[PDB]
Write a protein that binds this ligand. Sequence first.
Ligand SMILES: C=Cc1cc[n+](C)n1C
Lengths: 39, 156
Amino acid sequence: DMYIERAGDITWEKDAEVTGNSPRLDVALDESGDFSLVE
Amino acid sequence: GETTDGVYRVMTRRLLGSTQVGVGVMQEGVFHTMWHVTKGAALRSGEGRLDPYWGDVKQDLVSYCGPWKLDAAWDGLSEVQLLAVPPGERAKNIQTLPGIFKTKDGDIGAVALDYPAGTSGSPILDKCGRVIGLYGNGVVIKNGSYVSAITQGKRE
Ligand SMILES: C=Cc1cc[n+](C)n1C
């Protein structure tokens, strides 16, 4: 039995921690909603 | 139950203790999360019940109490923020420039940020605070790192 609990407001934070790269990938999406890499 | 707009944890007591299986967005009276978090099951909010209203395994999305309401889209140029809600940890904003998933049916933004499975359903926002999609359905690339699609539904 699943339940939900509030965790916060949805707002943009000025000066949030900035990280992560921006990869460009060729992918396939199957009927089960799974993404996979195309090579 | 609590119907205030915002981000929420999705919990279960089926496993050991109380376990966070994902996250979602309450907006305009509708609860939005990824299909793989709830598997389409009903949810509790205090003493009230949230019933599924729309869902799609392929898109990996589900809405409760009404139709999908989120319709903002990544502009393809600007940095966005993941409002990560990890299990047992405070909600935190992470800013990043999305990458791209190129598919035979078009291109989708993707964020290269790695959080526990229970963070699935966390919202990705633009600079106006609009939800442009949910984090948690993606792929593991060559060097073993996680990249999530920016998954957004259609507002009918
Ligand atoms: C939300 C994160 C997530 C979803 C699936 N995986 C493997 N990971 C790390």
